Design an enzyme around this catalytic site. Sequence first.
Site, PDB file in Angstrom:
ATOM      1  N   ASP A 126       0.858  -1.177   0.000  1.00 17.78           N
ATOM      2  CA  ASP A 126       0.000   0.000   0.000  1.00 17.78           C
ATOM      3  C   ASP A 126       0.894   1.227   0.000  1.00 17.78           C
ATOM      4  O   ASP A 126       2.119   1.108   0.008  1.00 17.78           O
ATOM      5  CB  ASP A 126      -0.879   0.027   1.250  1.00 17.78           C
ATOM      6  CG  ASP A 126      -0.074   0.177   2.526  1.00 17.78           C
ATOM      7  OD1 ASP A 126      -0.688   0.411   3.585  1.00 17.78           O
ATOM      8  OD2 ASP A 126       1.169   0.058   2.477  1.00 17.78           O
ATOM      9  N   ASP A 148       1.523   4.578   2.215  1.00 13.02           N
ATOM     10  CA  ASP A 148       1.233   5.268   3.475  1.00 13.02           C
ATOM     11  C   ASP A 148       1.326   6.774   3.320  1.00 13.02           C
ATOM     12  O   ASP A 148       2.334   7.301   2.839  1.00 13.02           O
ATOM     13  CB  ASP A 148       2.199   4.820   4.563  1.00 13.02           C
ATOM     14  CG  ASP A 148       2.287   3.334   4.660  1.00 13.02           C
ATOM     15  OD1 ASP A 148       1.227   2.692   4.722  1.00 13.02           O
ATOM     16  OD2 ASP A 148       3.412   2.804   4.673  1.00 13.02           O
ATOM     17  N   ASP A 202      -6.270   3.970   3.832  1.00  2.07           N
ATOM     18  CA  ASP A 202      -6.430   4.728   5.075  1.00  2.07           C
ATOM     19  C   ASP A 202      -5.593   5.992   5.046  1.00  2.07           C
ATOM     20  O   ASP A 202      -4.777   6.186   4.151  1.00  2.07           O
ATOM     21  CB  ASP A 202      -6.049   3.890   6.301  1.00  2.07           C
ATOM     22  CG  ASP A 202      -4.605   3.438   6.284  1.00  2.07           C
ATOM     23  OD1 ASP A 202      -3.767   4.059   5.600  1.00  2.07           O
ATOM     24  OD2 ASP A 202      -4.299   2.459   6.984  1.00  2.07           O
TER      25      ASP A 202
END
Lengths: 445, 288
Positions: free
Chosen positions: A168, A170, A219
């Site tokens: 992913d 960040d 996120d």
Amino acid sequence: NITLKIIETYLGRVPSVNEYHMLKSQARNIQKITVFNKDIFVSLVKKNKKRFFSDVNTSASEIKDRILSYFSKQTQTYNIGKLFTIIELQSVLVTTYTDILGVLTINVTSMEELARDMLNSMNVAVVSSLVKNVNKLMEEYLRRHNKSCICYGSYSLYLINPNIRYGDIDILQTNSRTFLIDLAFLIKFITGNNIILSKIPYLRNYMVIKDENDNHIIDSFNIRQDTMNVVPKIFIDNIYIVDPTFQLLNMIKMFSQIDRLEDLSKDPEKFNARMATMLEYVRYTHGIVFDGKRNNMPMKCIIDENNRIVTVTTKDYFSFKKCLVYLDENVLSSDILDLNADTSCDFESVTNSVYLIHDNIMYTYFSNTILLSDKGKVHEISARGLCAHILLYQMLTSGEYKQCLSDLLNSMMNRDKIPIYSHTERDKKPGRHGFINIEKDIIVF
Amino acid sequence: MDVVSLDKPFMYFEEIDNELDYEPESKLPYQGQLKLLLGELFFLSKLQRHGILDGATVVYIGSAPGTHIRYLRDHFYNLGVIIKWMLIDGRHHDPILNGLRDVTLVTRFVDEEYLRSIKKQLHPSKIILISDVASGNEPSTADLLSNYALQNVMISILNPVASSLKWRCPFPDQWIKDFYIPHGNKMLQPFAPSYSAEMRLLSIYTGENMRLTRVTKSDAVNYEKKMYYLNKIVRNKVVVNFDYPNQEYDYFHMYFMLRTVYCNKTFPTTKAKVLFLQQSIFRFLNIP
Ligand SMILES: Nc1ncnc2c1ncn2[C@@H]1O[C@H](COP(=O)(O)OP(=O)(O)OP(O)(O)=S)[C@@H](O)[C@H]1O
Ligand SMILES: Nc1ncnc2c1ncn2[C@@H]1O[C@H](COP(=O)(O)OP(=O)(O)OP(O)(O)=S)[C@@H](O)[C@H]1O
Ligand SMILES: [Ca+2]
Ligand SMILES: [Ca+2]
């Protein structure tokens, strides 16, 4: 007067007494919503779909209906709470989609051995495909929003060393919620599936988008402009990444958390690459020499197990005699108030703690477990973590830290594994698991 | 003449280092709203700073009319801090607080039963409590005691992570009996009435340990004298080393509160930030 006509048009009916009273004050945002051209939006979303979600098989007609349906679901909603929600979310799209997602459419291998040596000594313990798409979209995002979005972790290091594999990307942002809401809608419209945004209590200003099946999508951590301005950053490939030097420091603090060491043993290879890349960077960037020589580092750390405070004698490297590291953030917060200190430096999720220098004593909180080598004895892995935690502050305040960082790394060399005898638990962080459920017209925090 | 130079204003009661015997013989528009706005902005900013405000439910008892609360709400909202506001009062709040999804307006007088009710409803939400409950001349000591008993009840039931409670010690000559209040810092309030002895007790709780300290008549003598000295001597001074458009003590005090407030707009100097915040606040409160 004009308010009533606004509300009536918006609701597609005549406002009941209660509805005119409740929505009366939102008259302004409501008009913005009504006036918004829904055709250009459908066009925008489609254009986006082709560049980042071509592999998603859905009708341009299927997209249109979902969209137009949402911009008119007020006309079928009578519950005032649900109405307030729709108006809030719609406004986020109307006011920010174009600026956020709309804009989107126009030496290492040498340090590997040193890395193994360091890591082996520490080895002593014992998800929807939409991500592929979202990931590629964030690659562009990071480039168009350098001022409000910064990257760290794997991807940021991958830009330095293509050999790094990343699952992913960040990111830290000054507008996480707006971004996450915009992205959630984009996915909702293209995919047709109901995503949920949720907020996690024990994380600071943290929010995550999960799919219909609770599968992680993406996120983000929110930080204020203050924080964003002081975070050590580097410009790479037209994107900002957290300075690898600072990330190295956080990695050291991270290995103090029990769970992380357990990860290190499961797959040691994963960390060698990232470790090596950062070591490389620092040596080249700061002229740091790696000789097993570095004194006073691992600066004495004494635990007072009953009060859960680790004293770190820092007088050798800093102006403040010592640093009291609390393991319970609420105890720290209360004790700082007792000192009548109102200006403790806060860096939110970046350090997950405030830092206060008062009467030449630093006060701070450590968010990871503290490993012990023996009863009442701090394990050298945690000692380096504590030390690293303090150095983060030095970096955030443009203070001295270079020599200490050198001493810290060198102290990780030629070390014999020391078993973990025990560890402290983290403090519990109260709070509700908040969320935004678009299809159910519910926002609960 | 009657000026003075200070390194900082007195932020908490415990700092006041002098006293004067009270004397029975002892201005701005909407100054009461400014008093609450500053104190709460300060309190909430401290909680934001130390990370407890993030995702909290701010339960405000005795908040009506609460006009100033709309300013606090937009401030944090614009900083992207997620908060749930629950405003409770026996009387109605200013209409500007209506139509906001993140703020619940409850009209009702609180009692033990009700407190238990919203606690079940809010749980497991992190709760931040702010109490400004009253009860017409000056409250009797019996009314004040009834008030502090209720505030304690709020804390024990709601189990907040932090609280700001109205705190004004009964006058010496009107003592009834000793009582207890949570341990905490007694924040002084700029722009409070000329001879007000009122302050704000700020507490950050540590686990299941509600710390309770006794207040005695002797403490009452002390409260009255310290506050009288502060109101009579200190608050009437112009601070000469305070480089600001208004050098009045109250503005000096206000400056040390607003300087701790976060703002996403960037300023060159702290002064520029405080100036902006002050104007923003006065503009909002309709104070020239
Ligand atoms: N999708 C849309 N729906 C309704 N109004 C829009 C839309 N896009 C733009 N506007 C209006 O046009 C003005 C702003 O134009 P922009 O939003 O900045 O550019 P844009 O047409 O969306 O470019 P795109 O994102 O290049 S791909 C405002 O008056 C908006 O109300
Ligand atoms: N518990 C922690 N304490 C201190 N720092 C942390 C902690 N967890 C993560 N970090 C920091 O944040 C960085 C990224 O978090 P990660 O999840 O490890 O990203 P990543 O390793 O690149 O992602 P993958 O899935 O493992 S490829 C780490 O390299 C650390 O610097
Ligand atoms: Ca990662
Ligand atoms: Ca991540």
